[PDB]
Design an enzyme around this catalytic site. Structure first.
Site, mmCIF file in Angstrom:
data_model
loop_
_atom_site.group_PDB
_atom_site.id
_atom_site.type_symbol
_atom_site.label_atom_id
_atom_site.label_comp_id
_atom_site.label_asym_id
_atom_site.label_seq_id
_atom_site.Cartn_x
_atom_site.Cartn_y
_atom_site.Cartn_z
ATOM 1 N N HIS A 186 0.823 -1.422 -0.013
ATOM 2 C CA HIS A 186 -0.489 0.206 -0.139
ATOM 3 C C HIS A 186 0.717 1.184 -0.044
ATOM 4 O O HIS A 186 1.070 2.328 0.938
ATOM 5 C CB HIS A 186 -0.924 -0.349 1.565
ATOM 6 C CG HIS A 186 -2.302 -1.122 1.260
ATOM 7 N ND1 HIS A 186 -2.133 -2.323 2.003
ATOM 8 C CD2 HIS A 186 -3.054 -1.078 0.317
ATOM 9 C CE1 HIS A 186 -3.039 -3.246 1.680
ATOM 10 N NE2 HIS A 186 -3.191 -2.426 1.055
ATOM 11 N N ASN A 209 -5.276 -7.016 -9.436
ATOM 12 C CA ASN A 209 -3.857 -7.254 -10.045
ATOM 13 C C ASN A 209 -3.313 -8.200 -10.721
ATOM 14 O O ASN A 209 -2.284 -8.667 -11.501
ATOM 15 C CB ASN A 209 -2.752 -7.351 -8.977
ATOM 16 C CG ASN A 209 -2.856 -5.770 -7.531
ATOM 17 O OD1 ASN A 209 -2.327 -5.997 -6.596
ATOM 18 N ND2 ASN A 209 -2.752 -5.062 -8.634
HETATM 19 C C1 LIG Z 1 -8.442 -8.179 2.581
HETATM 20 C C2 LIG Z 1 -8.975 -9.186 1.594
HETATM 21 C C3 LIG Z 1 -9.374 -9.819 2.016
HETATM 22 C C4 LIG Z 1 -7.948 -8.378 0.352
HETATM 23 C C5 LIG Z 1 -6.935 -7.700 0.304
HETATM 24 C C6 LIG Z 1 -7.297 -6.953 -0.544
HETATM 25 C C7 LIG Z 1 -6.012 -6.051 -1.476
HETATM 26 C C8 LIG Z 1 -5.581 -5.646 -0.085
HETATM 27 C C9 LIG Z 1 -6.214 -4.889 -2.519
HETATM 28 C C10 LIG Z 1 -5.817 -3.894 -2.480
HETATM 29 O O1 LIG Z 1 -5.685 -2.582 -1.914
HETATM 30 O O2 LIG Z 1 -5.702 -6.663 -1.862
HETATM 31 C C11 LIG Z 1 -5.244 -8.601 -2.020
HETATM 32 C C12 LIG Z 1 -5.949 -9.219 -0.733
HETATM 33 C C13 LIG Z 1 -5.258 -10.133 -0.624
HETATM 34 O O3 LIG Z 1 -5.709 -10.810 0.507
HETATM 35 N N1 LIG Z 1 -4.848 -10.988 -1.586
HETATM 36 C C14 LIG Z 1 -4.682 -12.091 -1.561
HETATM 37 C C15 LIG Z 1 -4.675 -10.034 -2.191
HETATM 38 N N2 LIG Z 1 -3.658 -11.433 -2.976
HETATM 39 C C16 LIG Z 1 -2.542 -10.935 -4.360
HETATM 40 C C17 LIG Z 1 -2.220 -8.829 -4.353
HETATM 41 C C18 LIG Z 1 -3.391 -7.970 -3.664
HETATM 42 C C19 LIG Z 1 -4.562 -8.526 -2.138
HETATM 43 MG MG LIG Z 2 -7.389 0.240 0.674
HETATM 44 ZN ZN LIG Z 3 -5.903 -0.069 -2.563
#
Ligand SMILES: CC(C)=C[C@@H]1C[C@](C)(CCO)Oc2c1c(=O)n(C)c1ncccc21
Ligand SMILES: [Mg+2]
Ligand SMILES: [Zn+2]
EC number: 3.1.4.53
Length: 324
Positions: free
Chosen positions: A73, A234
């Site tokens: 982030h 992503n």
């Molecule tokens: C908290 C939950 C449930 C999700 C988050 C959301 C977020 C932080 C959104 C960007 O702010 O990005 C990912 C998440 C996640 O759990 N995984 C596994 C990811 N894997 C790969 C790339 C991004 C993510």
């Molecule tokens: Mg956010």
């Molecule tokens: Zn974000």
């Protein structure tokens, strides 16, 4: 190096722009140069009388308040969401749907949507009795903070990029930006997707074959899910970019788990580095969250998003293949 950066910025209208390479070539200023490039491409400086030196000054200050020592982030993620939203705004099924103020609001919201993110989740900030959770009463703690910082920085010296908007225009943009950023709270994903499915079921188009949005509720709902899709984009990017985003979020998750373990707290999912399955988490992330969302968005703008959906399904197939 200025020539190499200008060459890469020619892909700003393309999905899967190499935002990490742009961060290198711009001297760790991806958010500033991508926002500036997008504002010229959309001719937003003349439309809203934004002085170019005021824009650069704010963008540099906003980029500074993203943490450089947070793995995911950070300002690269902010630049990635801005550019992904910019491409989603240009989709044929949305041509001439949104006004120049709604376009400005959606892009501005993407730029500030994670500013001053400390690298830990809302639940961690709540469970640890943090000052942020105390200020915001455990409700959209991070997202409220991002908005507060993003708007306050407009009051710094030569930073009010909205100085020549009418009071009506500033009033409308501020509400739209708040509604959008608050919708990036992951605890609202299910309700956001459920409403998006209802809209796909009751879809209506204009005589030019373009999505019809009658009222503020439907218009802000599309803008909310658009920035939410860019936030969760992503796994829809080329694999060499996707894997870098996965490495960065896992580092951030592992660091939260170490703080959770050090405090004697129960480790959050995917945050225990001693018992983590990165590949299976990515598969579950796509199957239960990312693909249902993007499949619904693809139905809304069919067939504009088919290649993005194809890449997501290929990446899911690949991450699956690494498990056995
Ligand atoms: C908290 C939950 C449930 C999700 C988050 C959301 C977020 C932080 C959104 C960007 O702010 O990005 C990912 C998440 C996640 O759990 N995984 C596994 C990811 N894997 C790969 C790339 C991004 C993510
Ligand atoms: Mg956010
Ligand atoms: Zn974000």
């Amino acid at each position: 190096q200025e020539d190499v950066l200008a060459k890469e910025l020619e892909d700003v209208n393309k999905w899967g722009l190499h935002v990490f390479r742009i961060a290198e070539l711009s001297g760790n200023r991806p958010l500033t140069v991508i926002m500036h490039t997008i504002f010229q491409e959309r001719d937003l400086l003349k439309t809203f009388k934004i002085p170019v030196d005021t824009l650069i000054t704010y963008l540099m200050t906003l980029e500074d308040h993203y943490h450089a020592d947070v793995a995911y982030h950070n300002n690269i993620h902010a630049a990635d969401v801005v550019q992904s939203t910019h491409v989603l705004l240009s989709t044929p099924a949305l041509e001439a749907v949104f006004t120049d103020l709604e376009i400005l609001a959606a892009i501005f919201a993407s730029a500030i949507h994670d500013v001053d993110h400390p690298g830990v989740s809302n639940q961690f900030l709540i469970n640890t009795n943090s000052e942020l959770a105390l200020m915001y009463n455990d409700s959209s703690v991070l997202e409220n903070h991002h908005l507060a910082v993003g708007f306050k920085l407009l009051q710094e010296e030569n930073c009010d990029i909205f100085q020549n908007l009418t009071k009506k225009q500033r009033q409308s943009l501020r509400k739209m930006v708040i509604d959008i950023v608050l919708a990036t709270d992951m605890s609202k994903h299910m309700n956001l997707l459920a409403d998006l499915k209802t809209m796909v079921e009751t879809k209506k188009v204009t005589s030019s074959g373009v999505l019809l949005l009658d009222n503020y509720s439907d218009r802000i709902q599309v803008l909310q899910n658009m920035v939410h899709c860019a936030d969760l984009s992503n796994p829809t990017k080329p694999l060499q970019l996707y894997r870098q985003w996965t490495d960065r979020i896992m580092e951030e998750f592992f660091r939260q788990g170490d703080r959770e373990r050090e405090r004697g707290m129960e480790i959050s999912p995917m945050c225990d580095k001693h018992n983590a399955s990165v590949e299976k988490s990515q598969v579950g992330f796509i199957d239960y969250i990312v693909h249902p969302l993007w499949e619904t968005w693809a139905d809304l703008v069919h067939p504009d998003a088919q290649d993005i959906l194809d890449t997501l399904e290929d990446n899911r197939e690949w991450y699956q293949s690494t498990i056995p």
